[PDB]
Amino acid sequence: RAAPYGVRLCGREFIRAVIFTCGGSRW
Amino acid sequence: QDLQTLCCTDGCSMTDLSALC
């Protein structure tokens, strides 16, 4: 919660969003 | 924590997510 904006992420969706931001590192 | 745990409840910033990956 560093940035003002926030999105509801749960389960695989949460992890996918992380990887999405990561730029498709290896998922 | 606030990044993972609180993300489902309140919400986590995509920028923050970078730390996990």
Swiss-Prot record, chain A:
Domain of life (superkingdom): Eukaryota
Q: What is this protein called?
A: Relaxin-3 B chain
Query: Which species is this record about?
Result: Homo sapiens (Human)
Where is the organism placed in the taxonomic lineage, from the top?
Eukaryota, Metazoa, Chordata, Craniata, Vertebrata
- From the UniProt record, report the name of the gene that encodes this protein: RLN3
Shown part of the complete sequence: 26 to 52 of 142
UniProtKB/Swiss-Prot annotation, chain B:
Q: Which domain of life is it from?
A: Eukaryota
Here the disulfide bonds are C7-C12
- Transmembrane stretches in the record are none
Protein name, entry field: Insulin-like peptide INSL5 A chain
Q: Which organism is it from?
A: Homo sapiens (Human)
> Lineage in the entry?
Eukaryota, Metazoa, Chordata, Craniata, Vertebrata
